[PDB]
Design a binder for this molecule. Structure first.
Ligand SMILES: NC(=O)c1ccc[n+]([C@@H]2O[C@H](COP(=O)([O-])OP(=O)(O)OC[C@H]3O[C@@H](n4cnc5c(N)ncnc54)[C@H](O)[C@@H]3O)[C@@H](O)[C@H]2O)c1
Ligand SMILES: NC(=O)c1ccc[n+]([C@@H]2O[C@H](COP(=O)([O-])OP(=O)(O)OC[C@H]3O[C@@H](n4cnc5c(N)ncnc54)[C@H](O)[C@@H]3O)[C@@H](O)[C@H]2O)c1
Ligand SMILES: NC(=O)c1ccc[n+]([C@@H]2O[C@H](COP(=O)([O-])OP(=O)(O)OC[C@H]3O[C@@H](n4cnc5c(N)ncnc54)[C@H](O)[C@@H]3O)[C@@H](O)[C@H]2O)c1
Ligand SMILES: NC(=O)c1ccc[n+]([C@@H]2O[C@H](COP(=O)([O-])OP(=O)(O)OC[C@H]3O[C@@H](n4cnc5c(N)ncnc54)[C@H](O)[C@@H]3O)[C@@H](O)[C@H]2O)c1
Ligand SMILES: NC(=O)c1ccc[n+]([C@@H]2O[C@H](COP(=O)([O-])OP(=O)(O)OC[C@H]3O[C@@H](n4cnc5c(N)ncnc54)[C@H](O)[C@@H]3O)[C@@H](O)[C@H]2O)c1
Ligand SMILES: NC(=O)c1ccc[n+]([C@@H]2O[C@H](COP(=O)([O-])OP(=O)(O)OC[C@H]3O[C@@H](n4cnc5c(N)ncnc54)[C@H](O)[C@@H]3O)[C@@H](O)[C@H]2O)c1
Ligand SMILES: [Cl-]
Ligand SMILES: [Cl-]
Ligand SMILES: [Cl-]
Ligand SMILES: [Mg+2]
Ligand SMILES: [Mg+2]
Lengths: 558, 543, 556
């Protein structure tokens, strides 16, 4: 119906002003573009110049996402050019604001919307998706959008943004990516009264119908695209996130980045710290502020790391303590202890702490991990206590956004006199102490892990993702940190290098999957690096010029 | 492009206004969020998102983005807020957009025909995907109103112009064709700009230029028909007049900068005459300027005078012009071309006013506040009701302000401007906007299958514009109908021009309608969504 | 979505092996065709060779129509190459046999099917037709397929075949042609019991629903395509055909070829005969065998011609007699005479004849016209009587099919010793007499009239078609007979020349329409011949080669 030449109308093939003169003439585009032939380089520079003239992150978001619908290769190029700056525009924290502020005007689909009203008919919706070879699905129900809570269908930006990073960071083919928003209602009263809300006007269905709908989705996706289709859950509520991971992980190819990706990036930072503090693992003691999704994810992966290094499971668990909103998790406390928290709930020490500071002084941890999301609870006295107890205290302030962090880099470095090994969830710039020393703290961003893991799983035709895959990814991340970087105080490789980092993780994870009988792509490649690098999708333009050539044309017909 | 055509095609796409049944039957279920909206709701969302934006440029970018997604929604939004949005989608915002942002292409915006394509223009015209073009707007970017030579960075102008063809007069958008002709630019900044989107050469001013324009006119009419309306916009003055003269009897063509300007200015003068009722033979017009606008307006004034019973010669004798080189008089120092000769019969303009004693002064100089307090007072001295038109744009280049005009004449002046002014005993001054004329004229010409456009058409359009003023409006000193009513005004102008065309044997659409009002109103394009629901029904109830 | 290159898959644009090497490479067809580049000339010769190895007319039909669905321009080239021989294959009498024998396997739509079950929803069916600029519609309900009777939806082929002749003969653009079959049931008992019948299993609806459906169709077509859209009715039952022509001719742009085309082609033949027999019109006497729809249509057009040449209507009517299955139409006879027959019913002569031979001897006509559909009733005694009464007797045997014709050409020329001016509606070949003289009999084929009339009406944006248009067409046809042809007693131009003949008719009719204020296309062309010839559709392939060229030979 859309009248015009398909190759310029389709964002997947469209090159815009980068179509060559001969391409334009042969493909019937001559006159439909201005009389200037550009390269992708020039198009990209025009974009970057224009973006600088816009004020709010939201204006930027609207501009850059517009390009995804016009010229796909230009879009990914622009993103890759300025990846560190643009990742928080296209994804968290900007993405979640955009729908609520602006909404959207549709032309091309953004992804699949599956509502509770569609129960019994989900396969029909999946069959409406235009692409036939989906390899990566990211799904949300919008209940727990990181930093915003329940946005209902206004969270469908989150899977879209996530998959932009799958492609930009690890070269997963954009045409094989499928964002999905599950709409079972919203408990956000403001949205239910909003005439411009784009979802169902009902509270969240929490009946068996909810579970049945998620089941129907999983079956429909894998019926169409295959049982090895990667399905990643994102921004579900805590109960749902954990139980769906448990329900599906041995039946489908699935992971939850909020739980498992978090665990791996955190662990990687701790393994980097161990490069400085090389004392035996038997002497480490980890104290968490918080006992929620992040704490449990991280702690369970620390235990697997410790078990690999000679400790028994039970002994490893005894080196991890947690302190939540109600205090120290000890056996027989008043506050509730769920089954996930039970292995880290130990017999009370002689003195029972009231405050986190008291807990530090009594337990004497080597490491504190802040995942409470409740502001500056790593107080000056907590930080000082850590530096008094340990020569090189490990302090991870992972809560986001910056306002919710347990402390700043500034506080950490200054109050420990440059001795702390520090990492954060939110971005902090260099810290100069008065004695001249400069510290560059790392950010434990989930983007270090999920692109590379996803690529490896897909390329290996892997069918289930064990926690041990995330342990391997954590080790592969840390293995890329140079000596010079560690000396600067970095516990993570630079974010600017995310493309190279992701590919290197994919190679290591691919080696692991083949070595542990988790791959099904045979023949098995002899050189895993070559295998991965040859399959990554490239943002450079292809030639679309028809092949025109003379035949020899040297006897005539009778 | 993989997906459902009806959704991907902006001409048919309804977005969230696709109904539940439409979505299911057409295979769209799940490709849109689970909310059924109306066009009304989509429009309200857009208006909110726009009111939460500040930069005219950023508004332009956002609005024009809608055109490439959902055509009906785009035009709905324009129509809803037409007075405020016309300055965004057209002059003066549109000229700024390209130079500052450029464009990222997906869908074609229109045709680009370069001097490098000489000999091959027909193949370019044949690449345009629409088969039934009725309205072409063409520029070479040489004289963008307010900005000068922007070369290819002025394709935005035809685009925005044709948006107003549709929004104001209901000309079908699929039958509109914007055209930019690129023969180079003399803008040195552009020639050194790596982001410039045109040919890196000075303007070709050889015979090759004339030949390319000829080739263009032939190619367009070869494909689409000899009656295809071709409107010239933002050419340099020499080229504008000479091309109008060259093509007007050979093709269906007009130049809005010359003829539209003339008509809208005349309409204002006619509205003033209704209030003043000064005997036409006692009128004397003094122009500040003797360029394109002046010659255009003067020629139409003469035609108006002649139809009322003056001879051409005596009508011309009532018009004087005063340019940058002083008064235009026979045997002066400065150059007097043959276009100026009819109006060539004091060292400052103030002196000119005092020695000639005009009833009307028309400011088309583009050179700032040359209607000084002195000039105004001297007009108010000579005349009971002075006519002062300060047409130069933008606001800062105007000959005087509205407040200045009324204050210094004790509210006795009949005043109009090219640039906008708020109410100033309250006087509500009118803005002589070209949008009053071109949409209605273009619609009438198209619906009538007219083949050539006489100057009398623009005279008729001027009278039809003035006739829509109410007595109340005239008593407030308003010389132009409210811009908010541009749709109604444009249709009314179209009806009057349609009647004129049939009566003077310039229409070729037969049979001829008995009721021209109905004829025009039934043919205007509508931005309301249509039903796309397949027709499903049971049959009545086999060896 | 049919995967591949649209230009190749679409029969309208497809050139097959005539795609040039450069076209194939640039359009992404290289390797999808054999490595040989042919011209349309070679493709046509291959077809013609293959056709000769087909035996039955049915087999030839299936083969040639297959090409329509593959390569439209090749199809029309082929039809034009061998037009005289192929018109009887693509149209009557072969076409009606095809569905009954074979049915059809559908891919592309052949045309629109509108059933009585679709009443109230006809517009949505018309909206499903993929072409947006239809100028020519041919519609049937399948009730009276010429020579075959009620075939129901198995008469789908007739509108298809007719429109093929619109294109091939007059250059009406094929994408602007729309065949339509109205299915309201069938009275054919054989079809009702046929598990392979492709229509509704019911008797024909003869209620108000039938009339309402036809009205809904007319409105739906003109609502979509415009009030000037030409709608031609074909192979309706006689009475339905007549009443619908009356109902719609002043409201829509419509004609019925069975009524009006027939009358025009018959008249043309008679006008040709009159050029040979200089006798003044007032001395002609015409006797019809039959007094039905064909007799009345022809007679009414003869009268219009006679009135134009100085006779009063009443006096013109007095020159025409009719003899039906009950005998001569005379005032006061026992057998009913209906109101339409009354103008040609006269006071009985001295003797009332019992047989047609007796009627010939008693009335002594100059001309007999057979339209009884009852077999060989122009007996040798009838023929000999005509040749003893008249030096040059005019004998038209127009009944169909051939078995029902009143006599053969052989019979007519031999028994009149070569003196008769003869025409039939059947394909009789040349007749050689013993003295060596060869006679080529005229065929009153409607294809002489309908293509040229259709083209003129469309090109002029004509809105209604008067009977006077068919009179003009008849004169325009006869005007093309050369002096040499007139001497040899040819009453029609050669069928081989049908393209040229049709265009010449269209030019004359266009002139007529403009001169009588029946055209609405303005500006009016000064030169009507040029106007028409520049607008006829051509079967020559166009170039589909993209335009590739160098530009004349940048800040960093
Ligand atoms: N940087 C990263 O890669 C990353 C990854 C995941 C989560 N996070 C951040 O971690 C934080 C927590 O996320 P989550 O999903 O685990 O949250 P959660 O709601 O699942 O867990 C919160 C926990 O904090 C405890 N808590 C709250 N207030 C407290 C207080 N004042 N003192 C002690 N404990 C308190 C609660 O009892 C609970 O155990 C958030 O800020 C989130 O952004 C960062
Ligand atoms: N299997 C097919 O449908 C198909 C179709 C055409 C060609 N081929 C060819 O067959 C060979 C093997 O086919 P294959 O597709 O299994 O390749 P592969 O086996 O090398 O790829 C391994 C897996 O990763 C997927 N994959 C590869 N690169 C990807 C990327 N960048 N983003 C997302 N997923 C990616 C593949 O779909 C597959 O599941 C290749 O030479 C290929 O060109 C296969
Ligand atoms: N009117 C349009 O919709 C249209 C569309 C595109 C281009 N044009 C151009 O306008 C000029 C005149 O075009 P026009 O269509 O008005 O032609 P026209 O006015 O010369 O033709 C008169 C009428 O005959 C029809 N017609 C012409 N040739 C025909 C054929 N071979 N078969 C069937 N119908 C036929 C036309 O559709 C029209 O109704 C040409 O230069 C043409 O390229 C017109
Ligand atoms: N409101 C409308 O509908 C409308 C339409 C067209 C043009 N305009 C305005 O009219 C103005 C003139 O446009 P144009 O195309 O006629 O310009 P132009 O270049 O064609 O003519 C300019 C004329 O002004 C004279 N001039 C310049 N500076 C002068 C000075 N200081 N003193 C005296 N004379 C001086 C020049 O000699 C020349 O005769 C512009 O500001 C434009 O915005 C308004
Ligand atoms: N001519 C065709 O190609 C065509 C195709 C399909 C249907 N029809 C029907 O045939 C009849 C004849 O219509 P017509 O189009 O010849 O004449 P019209 O009376 O409908 O319109 C007169 C002229 O104005 C044009 N026009 C009408 N509305 C317009 C608009 N809103 N914007 C721009 N141009 C506009 C037309 O193209 C035509 O040139 C109508 O009933 C129409 O629906 C015509
Ligand atoms: N396009 C056409 O429909 C067309 C064109 C030319 C010729 N024809 C043929 O002309 C013939 C008549 O068709 P029609 O529609 O006028 O038929 P009809 O049924 O309307 O009229 C037949 C007439 O012949 C008379 N008749 C029947 N048997 C007779 C007999 N034995 N002796 C004398 N008269 C007799 C009937 O009484 C009646 O007057 C058919 O063979 C038909 O195919 C048809
Ligand atoms: Cl571009
Ligand atoms: Cl929308
Ligand atoms: Cl072939
Ligand atoms: Mg495939
Ligand atoms: Mg069309």
């Amino acid at each position: 119906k859309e009248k015009g030449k398909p190759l310029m109308l389709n964002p997947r093939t469209n090159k815009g002003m980068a179509f060559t003169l001969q391409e334009r003439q042969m493909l019937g585009l001559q006159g439909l573009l201005p009389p200037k032939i550009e390269t992708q380089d020039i198009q990209a520079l025009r974009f970057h110049r224009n973006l600088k003239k816009m004020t709010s992150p939201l204006e930027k978001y609207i501009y850059i996402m517009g390009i995804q619908e016009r010229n796909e290769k230009l879009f990914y190029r622009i993103l890759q050019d300025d990846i560190e700056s643009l990742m928080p525009i296209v994804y968290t924290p900007t993405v979640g604001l955009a729908c609520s502020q602006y909404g959207h005007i549709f032309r091309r689909p953004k992804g699949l919307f599956i509502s509770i009203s569609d129960r019994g008919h989900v396969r029909s919706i999946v069959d409406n998706w235009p692409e036939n070879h989906v390899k990566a699905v990211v799904v949300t129900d919008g209940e727990r959008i990181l930093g915003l809570g329940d946005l209902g269908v206004y969270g469908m930006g989150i899977p879209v943004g996530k998959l932009c990073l799958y492609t930009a960071c690890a070269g997963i083919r954009p045409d094989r990516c499928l964002p999905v928003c599950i709409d079972v209602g919203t408990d956000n009263i403001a949205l239910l009264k909003d005439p411009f809300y784009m979802g169902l006007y009902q509270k969240r269905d929490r009946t068996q119908q909810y579970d049945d709908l998620i089941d129907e989705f999983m079956k429909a996706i894998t019926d169409r695209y295959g049982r090895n289709t990667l399905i990643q859950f994102e921004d579900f509520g805590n109960h749902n996130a954990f139980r769906f991971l448990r329900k599906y992980r041995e039946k489908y190819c699935t992971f939850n980045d909020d739980i498992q990706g978090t665990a791996a990036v955190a662990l990687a930072g701790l393994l980097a710290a161990q490069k400085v503090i090389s004392k035996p693992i038997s002497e480490h003691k980890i104290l968490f502020l918080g006992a929620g999704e992040a704490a449990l994810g991280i702690a369970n992966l620390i235990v697997m790391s410790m078990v690999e290094n000679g400790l028994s499971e039970q002994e490893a668990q005894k080196k991890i303590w947690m302190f939540d909103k109600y205090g120290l998790l000890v056996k027989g406390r008043k506050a509730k202890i769920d089954s996930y928290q039970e292995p880290f709930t130990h017999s009370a020490p002689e003195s029972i702490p009231d405050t986190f500071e008291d807990a530090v002084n009594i337990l004497k941890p080597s490491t504190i991990i802040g995942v409470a999301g409740a502001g500056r609870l790593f107080t000056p006295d907590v930080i000082r206590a850590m530096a008094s107890i340990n020569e090189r205290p490990v302090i991870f302030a992972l809560s986001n956004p910056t306002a919710q962090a347990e402390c700043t880099a500034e506080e950490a470095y200054t109050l420990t006199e440059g001795r702390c090994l520090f990492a954060s969830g939110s971005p902090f710039g260099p810290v100069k102490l008065t004695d001249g020393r400069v510290f560059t703290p790392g950010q434990g961003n989930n983007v270090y892990i999920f692109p590379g893991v996803a690529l490896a799983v897909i390329l290996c035709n892997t069918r289930h993702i064990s926690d041990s895959v995330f342990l391997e990814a954590a080790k592969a991340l840390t293995s890329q940190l140079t000596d010079e970087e560690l000396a600067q105080g970095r516990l993570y490789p630079p974010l600017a290098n995310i493309q190279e980092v992701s590919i290197n993780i994919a190679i290591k994870v691919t080696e692991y999957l083949y070595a542990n009988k988790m791959a099904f792509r045979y023949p098995e490649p002899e050189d895993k690096a070559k295998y991965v690098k040859e399959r990554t999708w490239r943002s450079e333009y292809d030639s679309l010029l028809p092949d025109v050539y003379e035949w020899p044309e040297s006897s005539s017909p009778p």
